[PDB]
Design a binder for this molecule. Sequence first.
Ligand SMILES: *Cc1c(COP(=O)(O)O)cnc(C)c1O
Ligand SMILES: *Cc1c(COP(=O)(O)O)cnc(C)c1O
Lengths: 405, 405
Amino acid sequence: IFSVDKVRADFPVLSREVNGLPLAYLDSAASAQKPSQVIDAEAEFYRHGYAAVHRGIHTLSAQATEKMENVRKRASLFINARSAEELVFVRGTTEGINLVANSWGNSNVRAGDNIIISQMEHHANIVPWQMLCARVGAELRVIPLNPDGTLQLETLPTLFDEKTRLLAITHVSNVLGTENPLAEMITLAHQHGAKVLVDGAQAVMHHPVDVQALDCDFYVFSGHKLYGPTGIGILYVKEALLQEMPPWAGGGSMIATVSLSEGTTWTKAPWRFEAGTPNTGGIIGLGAALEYVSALGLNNIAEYEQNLMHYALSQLESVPDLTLYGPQNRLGVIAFNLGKHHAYDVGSFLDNYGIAVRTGHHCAMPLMAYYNVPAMCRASLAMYNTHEEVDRLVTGLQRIHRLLG
Amino acid sequence: IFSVDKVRADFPVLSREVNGLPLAYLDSAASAQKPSQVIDAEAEFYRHGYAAVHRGIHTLSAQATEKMENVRKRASLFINARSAEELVFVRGTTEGINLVANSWGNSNVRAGDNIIISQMEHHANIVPWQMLCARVGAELRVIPLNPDGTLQLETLPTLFDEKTRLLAITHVSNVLGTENPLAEMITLAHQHGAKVLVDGAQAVMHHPVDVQALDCDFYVFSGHKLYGPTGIGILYVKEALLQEMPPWAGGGSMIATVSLSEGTTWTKAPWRFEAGTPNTGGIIGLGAALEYVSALGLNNIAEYEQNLMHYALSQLESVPDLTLYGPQNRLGVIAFNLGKHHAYDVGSFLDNYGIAVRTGHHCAMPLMAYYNVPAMCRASLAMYNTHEEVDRLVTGLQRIHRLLG
Ligand SMILES: *Cc1c(COP(=O)(O)O)cnc(C)c1O
Ligand SMILES: *Cc1c(COP(=O)(O)O)cnc(C)c1O
């Protein structure tokens, strides 16, 4: 089993007060709070180990380079990659997806080809493909949704054909909490020679993720939602593909040699897509965030969060005129609207009770359009949230409905 | 005046031991150590203020957004920009220069135009222009050096003509410590309608920098060399230019609206070039690093570093077969070789005495070629270094020369 009380004690922010009331942070899906072990790992690095990592000569630099490469190894085991050199450090999920669309997309998607996304994609997994499709004259196809917030799988035969170069799909919806059948969809994609990029930003923190078993070709996720620092994410790429990807945004440790008369050359795999100075502080902290989550056990985390969610959905039945979006087996997030009140207002009232939720379009406008609403509220129920916080949310919605109804 | 002892006490790393000897960190030009005020600012943010900044509803998020925008304001005053909306947060100098070369370069440099750089440029200020010149069919011209490590200014009449769109020049050489006559060169560039991007990564920490007085069009620098965290830099752009720059690497707060049927639109100025989740931790810390440097006074810093340098250059006269590269009035860094010994070996011995210096090509290969050497040693003399550390360096070079000579 798994003790919320012992976990919560690790997170100094949860003692905080907002509007003079105790904080109920229900917005982890936007960005997670960080445990002490993560915060101090970063700070200790700065206080006693800090140096440049440009594979440099003196001791501090050599030790920092080893620290950073150990984190790359730890992250590869975390998602069960075959090799640490299949992992690239990126600024975040957004930049990783763009990296793939520029380096791989421009070399492998020609005029008259098509790319497939879904209608529940976060904008980070839409805009790069929309632009790749314009550059090269390709077509962007969209898997549509069902009312319950799952993908209309029956439509895949009309979307996959011999010219489909890539499926880009979310692992878990940041709005609905739907978990897509990645394994099976990847089998279909690979029958046509198409590659699959998986947007995993909302998945790696709710349960184990095994990129070999999935057999996905690209997998990207974000540090700051994995209880880690800002400014760091992970892009996984199959070795065979990665060693074929040409260069793009060239800098320092991405640039091998440069000549005014003969041009420049670029360094080998992972490192070639890591220009300039790496975010060594961020990397150190992501490392610790991986160790912390592993020490708790993603299966323990999955079990506690899953029961918190069942509890929450049961308690929410007693909220009048509540509209929920998504499936019964959602992970992590609950999306709703209250009667006819703008989500902006509902969120403002909950914040007034010290409850933080996200309101707006959640960086998923096509998904809002599908449901014919302009916005929704979203509450995240993460590993450090409690039955009491769910009770405050339920009570709060009841009060807002009595007051504004 | 200015007390080294009181400054050093702020930096916890300087108490560190390397190879069982006390550390003499002389590699700030690669990356600076950080004071406690910077480290704890970041950590305090994480412990008590952390949230997403996607201009979000609840209190923690609203307060974090205000924190970040205050840092943008503080940085604009720091370099004396007219407006905070002229500053863009970037991952670092490397990415900022590329940002300009993609957004501005692709729209303003056509086939048959030319761009001017210098021969002392760091690779970050070469490769983006080499590639822009290939994309569009333009010519990359190079200001050559003099033996003393200054620019051959007499050659500018053969390089500037009606088709020169941009001068990209370093403020201070990361290898030689030359400070280029930016103000005058910008006047010449502007007489031809050409814009100037200034690579300021090695300047903002040695003395005040006033982008209005310079009248440069772009100015970029790095957080981690300004005693700040990794993963954050500043790109300044004249408002008139910035509000004309088209989009590029699109994400989140860079993307305004997105539609599957109608396409996407992008948000206004600074923010439009800041995709995905910002590095809020890095930003917080850069903020504090700016406050710390300002509290000391860049003129006090300039005075102490300038005298440390005069002292160092005087003491180094007593080192046999020392070769120095650069001018007498260098800022910040000393580049040298010892007799005929590979810089790799010299650096290894100094590290053995606990002295950290950088060896290699310093991300400036064209500059090494100019001097017909493969590598150099470089020692940085920053605001927390001491006469004693200079004495250890001098003694160490004398010993290495006796032993290996
Ligand atoms: C938040 C998120 C992103 C964006 O990641 P960043 O770390 O902000 O760059 C992309 N996709 C999904 C599913 C997300 O939850
Ligand atoms: C180090 C430096 C750079 C590179 O900046 P990053 O922060 O590593 O991206 C570019 N130009 C100069 C002059 C530098 O000193």
